[PDB]
């Protein structure tokens, strides 16, 4: 009934208190049997949409970047985001190694530590990106095959919208229209769930605090910190550089963006903030014909915010499970995540949904008590992380639409 | 060789002829020969039905959620929705009441494999509730999870509507398309049922032929037991609730029926809420309901009218369970029944929805249709579904008019 | 750039590949190829058996809708009857030529070091009842061919009946679902084109292995296949088309003289759709009514079954024969008739001949994962390119043959 972000922070701050004192001389168990299931309900509602959004999303996403259905002003802004995600990934990993979130918290939940099962011959792991039956991939949660098929579909659809046959061209138009809309419904459903999130988020940390000790809160602050420093380090180290390098003034640029960022910071919605963003791009004096096209893109294809979230969440999730992870695997894991997140920029809680999808793609079964309880930690603090996530997404959309505006 | 012939006649001929053939082949006949030869024609029939059980429940619920969905729901609409909810309320109670009043099922104690069916029971409440949320909705759909499919089709249908309330025309057209295509699938699945009802006379023949030949003559009384339980609760609904609702709204019940008289008799003989809808609207005009009212509210009851199904399930549930051996309590009765009705929204008619829902409710309550008992128990009701489905639709239509008349008179604007 | 003529690419990959393979076979390292080269071929085979499900399904829904009565126009009904009575003959030639050359025996593959063993086969009741999908989403989800076929027809036909409805809500909904299912189908074809781009690499790796490992025997066994097709192929044009034209007072000699490049385009483009512009312009040169060829040509592009019928005839026989199992005339057609009867809507489509094979094997229970089945299919898939040129060339010749026969019955020459 009331401001949804307030609700989640209230449930979090209140929940960690309740959990923590109930932890000390309380009954970690009673929480586990009674409180926690409300939390589990929450985590179920999210993992639910993990499949439809990943697939429907990527079909739309592929079609968005798809050549040469891609316009010429478009091709440049795409090139922009690729070379920004580039840096946004490096920062992610760097900050994730810089703060070491996860080690320190050594979860062995069943009273047995989680043991990563590994891993078939390169041949078989590559071959198996190609879904043997795409309905089946989709049906029983194969991530890599769904990704591969949703790109190969999305790109194909666009080629059909370049056909002589209007029977053909309308058909494609229809399919894609319908796949979108599914995607679009899946998002509306996230909004709905975020409504339950304050109860759900409550129940989650309540348990984690009551059961994992007080150590966690420092481990989570470890996460939050690693994101937010990388986050501002992105704006400063890359955006300001790109603006400066294009004769735009970084200081006064921020002065216009100032509330467009603050809106994103508080609405979490790249789409919800889009009205405010476009109005500021007009204040900055970007061509109408430019920002009305390139801003609607960053709202969806902006990959840089998610790239920073995954960088850290990946590393913490894995680190806490026990498995110390190398730089190679870090990006392999991360690049995969970001490369499937295209089309999902905001979307309220995308950062967390992608995490689920990446774990399900790297084989870690969410049903295993450790994986679950590890994930459940980040899912608690997702709210906070998701504010910076969107805020940087928006800042980099303007930065891009401004750089590309100027070249026209 | 054209079966261009009245399809209801066909099924009743298939039924009354079939039970004779079966019954005499039973007495000094060869229950077995029937079982190996005649029955598979019956099983083909039961397959064609349980086929559509998944697409129609899903695609149907998406459309139905979207139809009741707020605030996409118009204000004339919101009152008629409230109507059907408080009528299904009563329709359910009568269902259970009549199902306990006649005791269909006990008396017939089927142990078909030569072993009695044994309900397997049941995970911790936590786990049964959590598992209503599909972990992967494609998967729910793919391998038949009922409760997760229900849950997802509602959460989808509602969401779609909210998208048709968007600024973004990209978004608004997208939603419109998806929902358009989900409908139409629903709509096609219905057209497929009509097709199957065409085979129903042969299939319904082979089904009771076996049941009679093998289950004794006890069945025909047990089935009359069902038919009765429905038809008495059925008319007891019209009298006890509709007439009270009309009387309570200054509408005259006696003269109301006098207009509805053929509109009901059409439904009773067409089994189709949609097929009868033309006749119904013309009678709503005879009763002098506003054009802008009945041309909206009647197309809804044709789909969302839940009261007829509520009575079918009430009795079929109790019989199917009772015959299996398991004596069922009043809590479970409605738990089971409310479930069924609440997923049957959007499926009013549809020729044989009564039977389809039964199959879906069983698959939802864990009873595997592959087990010989559950199968041979369902195969009984599926025979007589035809008869029951005439009263089902007739009451559906009577209560659509009752509703659209009660709501009409609260307007006149 | 791999943008160079795609057919050249594949023949270069084939002729080069067989050399490389074969010499690497003799004193080479059949094994090295197996571990390193072959996986590139396997990636190819995967990419194909990938789309086998969506195309069969989405394709048959479209196909059903295209022949569906009485949505079928009257000029249409005669052309449909034409292709049915030509597929009739095309099947017989298929089998005849497959028996006449004996492709397969001579190559006795036992790959694991154990020969493949056809597992057989449930009671006729169970194999027939199981054509009806218990849950159609599941059929689709886990590869069930026969159920997918059955449901895709029963859906496509139904959708068309809905486009004959009074209710525009209904008639648009159907129009949408069918529109969307199309496009999916249409996308799946675009995806094949994409794969054929990788085909030169993939095809190289496939025969490279087969030659290196299966001996030099194969090339003769494959020439055996190519021949059987191409002789049956031309024997179709001569024995049936020319007889049909002659029988309708059209002159076969001068008919060919117009079709001459329209066939040569098809022979070189492999696409019934790609060649369709050329075809229509030639139908105009032959002086067919504009309103006739602009309708009937677009059909044979998709429903022409006669080319595929000849491919399956021979591929079936070889594939089974090589596995070890000697196959009778009954089974031959049972297997083949099935294949052709699901292939409606898939005329071209670049590599449909091979995709249908995979689908017929998955329908007849032979698991593509078994190393023999796999290595046997992997042989035809190599030479598919060659076969597929004659496939489309005969498809086109017979579309013209039909549209000219049907044209003249309207008195539109
Ligand atoms: Hg998840
Ligand atoms: Hg069923
Ligand atoms: Hg295959
Ligand atoms: Tl994105
Ligand atoms: Tl976000
Ligand atoms: Tl209903
Ligand atoms: Tl009915
Ligand atoms: Tl075809
Ligand atoms: Tl072809």
PDB file of C-alpha atoms in Angstrom, chain C residues 60-73 76-77 79-81 83-84 156-157 160-161 295 299 302-305 340-341 343-345:
ATOM      1  CA  UNK C  60       2.470 -29.203 -40.138  1.00  0.00           C
ATOM      2  CA  UNK C  61       0.155 -26.683 -38.455  1.00  0.00           C
ATOM      3  CA  UNK C  62       0.643 -24.336 -41.439  1.00  0.00           C
ATOM      4  CA  UNK C  63       0.372 -27.274 -43.883  1.00  0.00           C
ATOM      5  CA  UNK C  64      -2.906 -28.520 -42.395  1.00  0.00           C
ATOM      6  CA  UNK C  65      -4.320 -25.086 -42.562  1.00  0.00           C
ATOM      7  CA  UNK C  66      -3.304 -24.889 -46.292  1.00  0.00           C
ATOM      8  CA  UNK C  67      -5.099 -28.024 -47.444  1.00  0.00           C
ATOM      9  CA  UNK C  68      -7.832 -27.610 -44.861  1.00  0.00           C
ATOM     10  CA  UNK C  69     -11.442 -27.771 -46.142  1.00  0.00           C
ATOM     11  CA  UNK C  70     -13.532 -25.882 -46.924  1.00  0.00           C
ATOM     12  CA  UNK C  71     -11.079 -23.031 -46.270  1.00  0.00           C
ATOM     13  CA  UNK C  72      -9.564 -24.595 -49.396  1.00  0.00           C
ATOM     14  CA  UNK C  73     -10.623 -22.748 -52.593  1.00  0.00           C
ATOM     15  CA  UNK C  76      -7.174 -25.277 -54.834  1.00  0.00           C
ATOM     16  CA  UNK C  77      -9.085 -28.499 -54.233  1.00  0.00           C
ATOM     17  CA  UNK C  79      -4.436 -28.913 -57.322  1.00  0.00           C
ATOM     18  CA  UNK C  80      -4.453 -30.695 -53.886  1.00  0.00           C
ATOM     19  CA  UNK C  81      -5.947 -33.762 -55.562  1.00  0.00           C
ATOM     20  CA  UNK C  83      -0.313 -33.609 -55.697  1.00  0.00           C
ATOM     21  CA  UNK C  84      -1.956 -36.506 -53.837  1.00  0.00           C
ATOM     22  CA  UNK C 156      -4.047 -26.608 -37.998  1.00  0.00           C
ATOM     23  CA  UNK C 157      -7.371 -27.980 -39.228  1.00  0.00           C
ATOM     24  CA  UNK C 160      -9.007 -22.896 -40.018  1.00  0.00           C
ATOM     25  CA  UNK C 161     -12.536 -23.718 -38.840  1.00  0.00           C
ATOM     26  CA  UNK C 295      -2.072 -19.155 -56.332  1.00  0.00           C
ATOM     27  CA  UNK C 299       1.385 -24.042 -52.855  1.00  0.00           C
ATOM     28  CA  UNK C 302       5.339 -25.930 -49.701  1.00  0.00           C
ATOM     29  CA  UNK C 303       3.002 -28.899 -50.117  1.00  0.00           C
ATOM     30  CA  UNK C 304       4.620 -30.592 -53.139  1.00  0.00           C
ATOM     31  CA  UNK C 305       5.404 -33.977 -51.596  1.00  0.00           C
ATOM     32  CA  UNK C 340       5.690 -37.888 -46.706  1.00  0.00           C
ATOM     33  CA  UNK C 341       2.491 -37.380 -44.789  1.00  0.00           C
ATOM     34  CA  UNK C 343       6.458 -33.540 -44.746  1.00  0.00           C
ATOM     35  CA  UNK C 344       3.521 -31.419 -46.028  1.00  0.00           C
ATOM     36  CA  UNK C 345       4.572 -27.718 -45.755  1.00  0.00           C
TER      37      UNK C 345
END
